[model samples]
Target: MRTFTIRNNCPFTIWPAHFTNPDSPTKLTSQVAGWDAPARSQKSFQVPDRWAGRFWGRRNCDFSKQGPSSCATGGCNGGLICDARTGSGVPPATLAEFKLNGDGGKDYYDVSNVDGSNLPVLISNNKGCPSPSCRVDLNPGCPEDRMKVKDGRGTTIGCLSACQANLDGNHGNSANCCTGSHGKPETCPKTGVKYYDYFKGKCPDAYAYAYDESSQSALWTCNKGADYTVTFCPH
Candidate 1:
């Protein structure tokens, strides 16, 4: 088994959610799908060595509402507790993704903003591996109107990627989404994507786009036995 420590460094409470990719070779079903973490709190859980999943934080949630829309950002289909099998939570949420005990006994991990970013995150480990983090608050400078997700108070709660924003008017086949003709890394270079520089400039260690693996730092690896820690609003 491997351990994961989830920490919240923000001033407000956040609901943390987990989702195992349906395509994952191994799934972690023992863990809770979602839970609340008050400011400056932390929790730990054990997972199978070969588990693969993603973790994200939901902000401004009111579970008393008992609806999918309980959260302003990163809300799952069900209210507080998510459906592990299908709930990936709404996008515009910062993600900490992991695939443990992968090829050659290495654990692959990354902090992905490819879907967009709501909170800053730091994914660290006990093995002294490179810590991939995106500590920049991207909401304030979201750049485009379509890319900004604001709450009722008019505060930017999330920032959508150019693909999520659909700035090109070609949702599924847009270059920003890296689909259709621009599906492959060889064809869809970072230079061709809109706002790629904005994201990469702020968080050089995170995945700014689909093929961002080309950056080398976008994806990280650690030894199989390394325990992980995911910190939200990691200043």
Candidate 2:
């Protein structure tokens, strides 16, 4: 197992008080909101391969006009986290957070995280490579039968299968629900397609999950007459 330290790096001094989610767009991540361990450091659990498919990074917080960061400079590409003297294939965007989207953990990884909105890593397993670039096969879990959502209060909706069915059914070219590809909205569960737990700000309950891959599948969400954000279970 390996570990990393998330130091106090909030954009604002007062921002630390409100900076809770590391995946927040412009929300700070200093030593205030427990982003770090007791010693002023956040101990990163060995990213599991079982949770790799969901390792996606986003740009900054600007969703509309301005998009995510595309550079791997400084900490953008993970040079500071991994090693500046060496070079790695890691994308440099994945090594920056704790609770991915919301539910936390990558489980699988293949790159660095800087932009914070790109799928910098691949969801595979624990089989990692050498230095310069450190990686593992990520096959993280999805919203099995419990789609957890928080609306003022937390609610768990058991609609994994149905949701995936709805999304998967609309995969590929323009379809009924999803306007993208036919199966573009759907992800591969067996091959490690992850469900990133979205935050309440950027996306209310936009979460991750594997709909049609499992045998005894189901779909549950916190969509009690409102919008629902989905992500893979254990993402």
Candidate 3:
């Protein structure tokens, strides 16, 4: 068993959600799809050893309506408690993704901004493993014309990637999305994608794009026995 603790250190409340990859052989057993985490609050869940999934934080959520629009960022189609399958939250979410006990008994993980970044995140473990984290807020520097995700009050809450914002002029089938002809790593070099440097320069340890594995720090590994803590707005 592996324990995953979700912590929120931000000034405002956030809704944390998790989704098991549909192709994974294992699924989360007792975990709720989503829950509220008031400022400085935390929650933990026991995950199967072979679990493969992703977790993200939702900001400015108002569950009173119980609809997709309840959150300003990372809102899923099914309200607070997202569906077990096909309920990955909407983009502009900072994702702490995991694939445990695979590839020579190693656990592979990453904090990805490929979809975009909504919150600062840190993925730490109790076993003194290398923690992959992105502690800086990217909202203030978000490109207003293409990558900014704003709330109804006109506050920039998230930063979308060039691919997510479809800035390549190829209808999202461009190299930035690592799609079409650029699906392979050999073809989808970071230099081919616009705004790739903006994210990679800020968060060197986290994933800035889909084929960022070449960065060495983009993907991380730890022993299977280690328990992890995913913190939002980590100090």
Candidate 4:
């Protein structure tokens, strides 16, 4: 078993959301959607050797009798639980992804904005493994054309990626969305768009689009058995 240490470094409270495959072997001690990590606090959990999932933060969330049913962004379909079984975090939420005990007993992890970005996120480990993160505050600098805020005006709650900008399959362009005409690794993103440039230039350590594995940025892997740390507002 390995450990996942989540820390909230932001000034405000943040609800950390965990998403796993519907049939994932991983089991969480707490409800994936009902917990909150207050400012400057941290929480740690154990994960199955073959665990696979994503972790993200929900901000300005409001709870009802049912639980955290709403948030400014990254809310999970108004439910306390979310994932491939429930639903993914609403677009524009920064993500920390991982696949533990993968091929050759190696683990792959990355901070991603492939869906878009609402907050800063970073992934690191105790063994000095490659630390990849998207720590840039994309709100003030987010483009008005591709913004997401449940309230319609919340300081540009999130900035949508180019794939999220044009095309409308509720997904985005096939080339940038990595589907239909471009579903394979070599076929996606036939050309780099502006959002790619913006994100790639800013973080340089995180993935800005699907199928963006490069030697310098995306595609960070290490031997399995690390106690990982996922930090919000690592900058």
Candidate 5:
């Protein structure tokens, strides 16, 4: 089964925009697509080409398991290749390509990281045929970016905490506090077990960032400056 790229509806794709002036008698520039593809590609509306075995949302894929040694897991296997799967029920799949013109063969596309920064990749296989697959490193700290989790398990608490530990920038390593094994990830401190002040409905001098496995979400508390108590769901 293969899946194609439906640029317009890509779960991760953001379309382009047309630059126009409501007051101007004439348009200065033609409409343009997203940072990846072109305006013509996104035009009055060129929906993406839907296929099979592609994206099922950000981290939900039907490919192979994200085992410790799984390449998709950012292991040594296959370097960076993944047997990605899709759910759009299709076969003899075809590859999709985002470009200035999907039909004119002059079309193009771009892929970036969460920060919207242009990644190293020079191409977007649009519709990755037969079985739409992507090979991304699972090492978040690697700059190559990685999966939302590690070891095919829960969130990347250990890795994330470790990263925070290295920074040690804040007056207290709040993110590091999450790595301790003695207690829950929500409130574990480096020396011992500690609960996030926000969970107790207390705002402190600094903010709180916790990986709540129970809710499968990273919550940012408004524990900063004791102004407001807000729980931010950052995914």
Candidate 6:
């Protein structure tokens, strides 16, 4: 097993959440559900080899014994657990994704917005793995139609991805949602999809769509056993 550190330097408080899809190629080693990461704090843990999972930050939350049921954005349906086996963070939330010790003894990792965006994120490793980051705050500049606000003209919450917009019936469709006939990479949106231009321009190292395997900057691999770090709001 190897250790990974998650650091929070963002000005606002974030509820760190975790999940490991059983279908992932690798079985998860850690089973942390959720916790708060106040600005300037960090947490470390050991991860299993060939482990695959995701971590994200939840913002503007109000929790109680009942768990987090009133979050401005990225609240999991089951409260703090996020048991992705049953649900995922509601977009727009930044996701730190990983797949460790895979084929050829290599690991794959990336920051993803196939769901949506809230805060900025940076992924790094002590080894030679590529360093990737989504450093821009997409809230203020988010497209009006895709932006989430606490109130009609209150604070901006997040920027909804096409898939999320569609799920909420908020100005989204198949072409942009990438579903049904467009479920697979070959059948989904082509390279240089315009909706993500803003994201690609800002966080060239992150994934803007669900099937971006060919996106030159979206995917990266490194040798196995590399230590990792996920920092929120590095900029």
RMSD values, in order shown: 1.7, 18.2, 1.7, 3.1, 19.4, 3.0
Tell me the whole-model lDDT of each prediction, alpha carbons only. Answer: 0.87, 0.23, 0.87, 0.73, 0.23, 0.73
- The per-residue C-alpha lDDT of model 1 at residue 223 equals 79
Residue 39 local lDDT, model 5: 20
What lDDT tens digits, residue by residue, belong to model 5 across residues 1-235? 1122223232233212221213323321221211233222222222322111111112222225443132221121121232222112111111121222222332222221211111112222323311111222223332212312332554331112223224334425434444334235535542331223211122121122333222311222111111110111101
The count of residue-pair clashes in candidate 2 stands at: 69
**Model 4 misplaced stretches (Cα beyond 4 Å):** 23-25, 29-33, 65-69, 148-153, 167-173, 185-187, 213-219
User: Number of clashing residue pairs in every model?
Assistant: 0, 69, 0, 0, 22, 0
Model 5, stretches more than 4 Å misplaced? 1-56, 60-99, 102-105, 114-134, 140-154, 157-235
| Candidate 1 C-alpha lDDT tens digits along 1-235 | 8889999999989999898877677766566789999999998988888888899999899877765688988888778888866578787889999988778888889999998999999998988888999998999999899999898899999999999898999976878999988888887888888998999899988888888765664249887489999999998
Off by over 4 Å in 2: 1-4, 7-92, 100-179, 182-235
| Tens-digit lDDT track of model 6 for 77-120 | 66766665765777777889887776677887889877678879
Residues 1-235 of candidate 4 have per-residue lDDT tens digits of 7778889999989888888766556655444543588999998878777787888888877766233347666778645555446656877678888888766778888888887887798899988778888777877776546544534454576777766765444453366677666677667653644456777778877777776655433258878478999999987
Error of 5 at 176 (Å): 22
> Given candidate 2, what's the lDDT at residue 164?
30
Candidate 6's TM-score: 0.86
Pick out the ten consecutive residues of candidate 3 with the lowest summed lDDT.
210-219
Candidate 3 has what TM-score? 0.94
